[PDB]
DNA sequence: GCCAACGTTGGC
DNA sequence: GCCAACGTTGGC
C-alpha cells in the first residue's frame, strides 16, 4: 500500500454527527505547512514546483 | 446509488 | 471575518 511522502503529514478525521457521520476526511500538510484537501489541487501544486520524484499517486486520499 | 472534490455555515 | 465542523452534488 501507499506511504506518507517525505516531510509531509497525512491527517485522517472521522465525522461524528450529521448525515455524513461515519465518513473520513483525509488532508495533507506539506513540509512548508501548506494544507491540501484534494489530489487535484495537490497534483497541481507539484506540477508548478517542478516535482520529479513525488507523484500524485503517492498521496492516498482513501481511508 | 453514492462519493471525490469542493461548498457552506454556526459559532466563536 | 475566519475556519473545523458537516453539506452538496456531478458524474462515474
Curated annotation (Swiss-Prot):
Signal peptide range in chain numbering: none
Record-annotated MBD domain positions: 1-63
Residue stretches spanning the membrane: none
Residues forming coiled coils: none
Domain of life assignment: Eukaryota
Subcellular location: Nucleus
Disease: Tumor predisposition syndrome 2: An autosomal recessive condition characterized by predisposition to develop a variety of tumors or malignancies, including acute myeloid leukemia, myelodysplastic syndrome, colorectal adenomatous polyposis and carcinoma, and uveal melanoma.
Summary of subunit composition and partner proteins: Interacts with MLH1.
Task of the protein: Mismatch-specific DNA N-glycosylase involved in DNA repair. Has thymine glycosylase activity and is specific for G:T mismatches within methylated and unmethylated CpG sites. Can also remove uracil or 5-fluorouracil in G:U mismatches. Has no lyase activity. Was first identified as methyl-CpG-binding protein.
The protein's name in its UniProt record: Methyl-CpG-binding domain protein 4
Amino acid at each position: 500500500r501507499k506511504s506518507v511522502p517525505c516531510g509531509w503529514e497525512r491527517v485522517v478525521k472521522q465525522r461524528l454527527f450529521g448525515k455524513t457521520a461515519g465518513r473520513f476526511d483525509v488532508y495533507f500538510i506539506s513540509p512548508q505547512g501548506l494544507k491540501f484537501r484534494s489530489k487535484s489541487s495537490l497534483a497541481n501544486y507539484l506540477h508548478k514546483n517542478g516535482e520529479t520524484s513525488l507523484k500524485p499517486e503517492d498521496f492516498d486520499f482513501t481511508v
